[PDB]
Amino acid sequence: PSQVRQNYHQDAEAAINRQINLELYASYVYLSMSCYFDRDDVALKNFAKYFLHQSHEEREHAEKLMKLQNQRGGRIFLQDIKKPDRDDWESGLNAMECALHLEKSVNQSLLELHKLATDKNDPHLCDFIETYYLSEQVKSIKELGDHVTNLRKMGAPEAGMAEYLFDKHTLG
Amino acid sequence: PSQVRQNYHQDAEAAINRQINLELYASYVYLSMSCYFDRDDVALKNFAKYFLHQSHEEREHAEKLMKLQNQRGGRIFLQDIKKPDRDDWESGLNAMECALHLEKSVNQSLLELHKLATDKNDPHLCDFIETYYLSEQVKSIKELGDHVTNLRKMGAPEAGMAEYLFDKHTLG
Amino acid sequence: PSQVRQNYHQDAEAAINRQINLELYASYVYLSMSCYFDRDDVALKNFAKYFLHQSHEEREHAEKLMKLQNQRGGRIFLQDIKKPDRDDWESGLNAMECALHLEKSVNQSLLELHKLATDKNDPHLCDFIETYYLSEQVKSIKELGDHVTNLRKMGAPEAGMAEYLFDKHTLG
Amino acid sequence: PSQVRQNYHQDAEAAINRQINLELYASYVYLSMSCYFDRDDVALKNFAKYFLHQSHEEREHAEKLMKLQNQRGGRIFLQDIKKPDRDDWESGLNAMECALHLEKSVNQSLLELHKLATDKNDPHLCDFIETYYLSEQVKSIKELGDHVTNLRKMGAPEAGMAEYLFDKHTLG
Ligand SMILES: [Fe+3]
Ligand SMILES: [Zn+2]
Ligand SMILES: [Zn+2]
Ligand SMILES: [Zn+2]
Ligand SMILES: [Zn+2]
């Protein structure tokens, strides 16, 4: 064992490595969305900016878990980052719905990690998760739900002005 | 020959004179568009401003080619600047589509000039074109394509609010 | 075809997608190196900082190619980002040697892309590569070669003070 | 019972008093280390400064637990502060190893206190521990492990320049 390791179960170490991969995957999905909105036949610059910001945030989430793994004396093992499920995200509304689904799946993973940390009596890891991840995920999910609600009410994607005006007012 | 002339083929000199005329023509087309949008029965001030800016930029493009011709020891020969194809540009969307077509035709001319410079082994002229023209044309074409996409999606020109709101948000 | 596309061969579009994947892979390799140097049993903070910076730079390289693909009217197709070849990078000297090898492999890919752009008479793409990529790769390769030279001369990794003092002076 | 006391078990009160004594003991150990490095035959001023800072921090830890005890309506009962195990700490490396061992023993005590608070359903005390203590201990342990790693790699204590240069660069 590492000279720093204390109260850090092998199952937690493995679960953190899984979470690192999931956050890197989420970053890649957001990047894919961002570059869809930069296409000349889509051309919604503030949707593109919004998803690029989310991509960079997910990267920061992954890097903070890497720092945690080393702080606790675990060892980082990286895996392939799978490509996103689609190249064409269809519409601003569809991308926001897909983002909401993704954020909820990441939250579910974090709740399973917290349950594991609780079961292994690892309060530092429980607190880490609560302080830096759970907080943030609830806020993200609520923001995406609000965006989906507004776009649907405005008539997106069939009402042509809806995504245009949402891009200007809400995301601009 | 001019005392400064070196590695500057007569065919390149002639092609630069042609390009000067094309950039002056493009400036004149944009000016025509600008003054259509200032009509009391059209009244889209930010479309007018956008096309007047493009007119002034094309002028600057022409003047920079004139400077190049003299720097290399060629001689500028000016020709008539033909009037634009229309006086009435119909709509904001139609003017943006016509601008996209014009910008692509200017780009095609510049690509033919680069091919000539390459064939005559004139690296200074190739670099000039690449650095000051090709760069700029790709950016212009992408911007106009984005504008056309947005106006179509918003319902222009039949949806009456589309050009009005595009003028305010995108061009304002 | 995209409304913006002009003089952009399908082979170039495919090669740009390959290059995007390679730059994302390079970013991931650097990230792996960074987190090796943050291990409690390695503990070289300025090596970690150096490789994290390189990771972020490779990301920016990838994102700029994505912007180019959309500017030219190509379509981005993402692929899996493969995991790096090692988790344990052994030493500061070994990581710098591996980085040098990686940077040379990325340079080779870029030279093949330039040759393709030249063969398809695509001067905008040739200029893009030259201006934003080739420049940068030569500088990177020279810097890594200088680092490898200095670490070897100092006696790394067997001379225990060498990586410590290099971390302080050169990377600090 | 105190007029403020609510949900504060007698076992928790006793455990907090034990922890106060342990933090005061740790402060005293660090003070002993600090004054070893100020000896004329040791003369490592930045090691001395580092351990004096740690001594003052442990004092602050103890005082914050005293504040908690009174905030919850417990009563502070002080005990003798035992003298440290050694007067002569031998070397910079040995002192850092002894500090790492001490910090891990304090962490173990805090984890036992958290388990007690959890078992007595005292969420305010659990949160206190997590927020102000567990966080800090993990960071301390990782920093000391990094210092031990670097000193060993540099050749301390037998390589005479190692502690001297570590004192200058890392601790200065
Ligand atoms: Fe509005
Ligand atoms: Zn995340
Ligand atoms: Zn022009
Ligand atoms: Zn790169
Ligand atoms: Zn303490």
UniProtKB/Swiss-Prot annotation, chains A, B, C, D:
Q: What happens when the gene is disrupted?
A: Homozygous mutant embryos die in utero between 3.5 and 9.5 dpc. Heterozygous animals are healthy and fertile and do not present any apparent abnormalities. They show slightly elevated tissue light chain ferritin content and 7- to 10-fold more light chain ferritin in the serum than normal mice, but their serum iron remains unchanged.
Q: What is its main location?
A: cytoplasm
Please give the CDD domains that the UniProt record associates with this protein.
Euk_Ferritin
Q: Please provide the record's keywords in A-Z order.
A: Acetylation, Cytoplasm, Cytoplasmic vesicle, Iron, Iron storage, Lysosome, Metal-binding, Oxidoreductase
Q: Which SUPFAM superfamilies match?
A: Ferritin-like
Q: Which Pfam families match?
A: Ferritin
Which positions are annotated as binding Fe cation 2? E58, E103, Q137
Subcellular localization: Cytoplasm; Cytoplasmic vesicle, Autophagosome; Autolysosome
* EC number assigned by the record: 1.16.3.1
UniProt domain Ferritin-like diiron: residue ranges: 6-155
| Residues noted as binding Fe cation 1 in the record, renumbered to the chain | E23, E58, H61
Q: Which family does it belong to?
A: Belongs to the ferritin family.
Instruction: Supply the name of the protein.
Output: Ferritin heavy chain
The organism of origin for this protein = Mus musculus (Mouse)
The major lineage groups are: Eukaryota, Metazoa, Chordata, Craniata, Vertebrata
Encoding gene (name)? Fth1
